[PDB]
């Protein structure tokens, strides 16, 4: 049940019951963290560290091996980005639609599509206001959002 689509699909991850570390994994908590610190140093959003670690490094979940999750580890060392990843990719998507709308202003379908992200951006903006991860006077401004990638 998407909030900006009429689709009611059911496709998501399903963790196994056991929270114990896999028997094939010999990497300790700090060795996973320095691998995480290596991926975060070269530039990578916490979604992608979890992706490639289960592909090549063979870890099941970071929360079961270490004491914390991926974003929480980066927050402890201060390697987390200035603004969260889901708002960042929404602003990046909103910039691309607005950049496309500059040339193709006849694209009424793309014009309608633009409000949906700005609707979705503001929902994430006021939620992060209450969690105090953003400044209380932060506001998504469309003209100056192109500076952020």
């Amino acid at each position: 049940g998407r909030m900006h689509a009429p689709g009611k699909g059911l496709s998501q991850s399903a963790l196994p019951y056991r929270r114990s570390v896999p028997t094939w994994l010999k990497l300790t908590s700090d060795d996973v963290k320095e691998q995480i610190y290596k991926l975060a140093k070269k530039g990578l959003t916490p979604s992608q560290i979890g992706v490639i670690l289960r592909d090549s490094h063979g870890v099941a979940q970071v929360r079961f091996v270490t004491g914390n999750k991926i974003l929480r580890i980066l927050k402890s060392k201060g390697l987390a980005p200035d603004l969260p990843e889901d708002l960042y990719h929404l602003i990046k998507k909103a910039v691309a639609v607005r950049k496309h709308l500059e040339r193709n202003r006849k694209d009424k379908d793309a014009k309608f599509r633009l409000i949906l992200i700005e609707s979705r951006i503001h929902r994430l903006a006021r939620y992060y206001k209450t969690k105090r991860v953003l400044p209380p006077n932060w506001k998504y401004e469309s003209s100056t959002a192109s500076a952020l990638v």
Binding site: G1, L15, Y17, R19
Partner: protein, 129 residues
């Protein structure tokens, strides 16, 4: 979305009772529902239930007997005084011989007879007979 949890559990087992299923599964497990199921079992309205406690909101399999007519839910949870508790069961229960209105009190969750014994009111939860 799923606003109330007890309402979905009670209607799911009422649909199974109308069809007459031997046992029924409800998808959420809550403390209120477990307390709700224990109220009906001491009176023998249902067969013996069990919960499947995974690492999420668990699933409850409730064995069913044929003694259930309808188990409804009252939303929202209106507070019930001791003065009009007779008025609540007059227009909700079928008769005064049977029918049970369960409602949460500070002493716990129990039917309307036991709330009269302890002389404690509270907010209504549902009705079942």
């Amino acid at each position: 979305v799923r606003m109330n949890v007890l309402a979905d559990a009670l209607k799911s087992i009422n649909n199974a009772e109308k069809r007459g299923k031997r046992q029924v599964l409800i998808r959420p497990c809550s403390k209120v529902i477990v307390r709700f199921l224990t109220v009906m079992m001491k009176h023998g309205y249902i067969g013996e239930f069990e919960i499947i406690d995974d690492h999420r909101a668990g699933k409850i399999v409730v064995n069913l007997t044929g003694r259930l007519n309808k188990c409804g839910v009252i939303s929202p949870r209106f507070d019930v005084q001791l003065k009009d508790l007779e008025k609540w069961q007059n227009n909700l229960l079928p008769s005064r011989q049977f029918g049970f209105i369960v409602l949460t009190t500070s002493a716990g969750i129990m039917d309307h007879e036991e709330a009269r014994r302890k002389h404690t009111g509270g907010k209504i939860l549902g009705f079942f007979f």
